Amino acid sequence: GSMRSSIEIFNIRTRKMRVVWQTPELFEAPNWSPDGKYLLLNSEGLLYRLSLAGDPSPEKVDTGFATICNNDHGISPDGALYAISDKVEFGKSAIYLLPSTGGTPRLMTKNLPSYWHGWSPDGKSFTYCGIRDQVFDIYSMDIDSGVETRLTHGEGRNDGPDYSPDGRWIYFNSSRTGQMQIWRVRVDGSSVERITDSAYGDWFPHPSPSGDKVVFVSYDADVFDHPRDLDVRVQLMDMDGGNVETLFDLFGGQGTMNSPNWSPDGDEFAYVRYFPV
């Protein structure tokens, strides 16, 4: 079988890349463990750990009944929990938490579909895209109480939320201006503001844990939604949207970086490059 996915890391300080693992399988959306030691990927509804030292061969995570996981998942700051978005139970995406060492998923969201997208720096809350009667909004939930908080209110479609490391902002994208652009909303909901103003559809914002940079993908403007297998750009900019640059061109899009992908040191991020079928 020819290669289909290349799990890779790019260091934004030295501007060097490395190939962790290539496979003829379709692997997607890496997270990076808070201890620095492994990547968490999904493939064909299952979750896998790939060690960054020694054997990078994917090791399957026991997600119990949750065997139709999608690309929206993450790891808690203390490293003890995984959050997954799975459709076994209700036929549409629902968010669960489980131990990072595997086990039985605990349902978080009763209102569906909901797509997990970022863990709060203090670990107490998470943020997600919730679709409610075809209204795409940013929500957050307090893990201990189960209380759902709506942060956007149907101004365009709003997707892909992830926290700034100071915990004051959630960055996301919104179609409110005509194409997907990066926006940010305060965690209390109280203000929102535009971060990119580009000729592209800008998707998957991830603020670096080091608090200086945001990485994201830019599709061509004539693209609708966030498909697989297109010629895209992996971009980087300052927190305030200044100094936008193209780090590299890439064949991909969907799967490349859906979920929070930074090393805990904030100097490197994980991503998947694809090869045409």
Q: How far apart are CA 254 and CA 247, in angstroms?
A: 18
Structure tokens at 160: 């892909």
- All domains in the chain, ordered by first residue: 1-277 (2.120.10.30)
Answer whether the bond into residue 260 is a cis peptide, omega within 30°: no
Q: How far apart are CA 277 and CA 271, in angstroms?
A: 19
SS (H, E, C) the chain: CCCCEEEEEEECCCCEEEEEEEECCCCEEEEECCCCCEEEEEECCEEEEEECCCCCCCEECCCCCCCCECCCCEECCCCCEEEEEECCCCCCCEEEEEECCCCCCEECCCCCCEEEEEECCCCCEEEEEEEECCEEEEEEEECCCCCEEECCCCCCCEEEEEECCCCCEEEEEECCCCCCEEEEEECCCCCEEECCCCCEEEEEEEECCCCCEEEEEEEECCCCCCCCCEEEEEEEEECCCCCCEEEEEEEECCCCCCCCCECCCCCEEEEEEECCC
Determination technique for this entry: X-ray
Resolution, expressed in angstroms to one decimal: 1.9
192 neighbors 267 (Cβ within 8 angstroms): no
Sequence-separated contacts (24+) of 114-117 with Cβ below 8 Å: 114/85, 114/139, 115/70, 115/72, 115/85, 115/159, 116/72, 116/73, 116/74, 116/83, 116/84, 116/85, 116/259, 117/72, 117/74, 117/160, 117/161, 117/162, 117/172, 117/259, 117/260
Which of 135, 154, 156 has its CA nearest to residue 202? 156
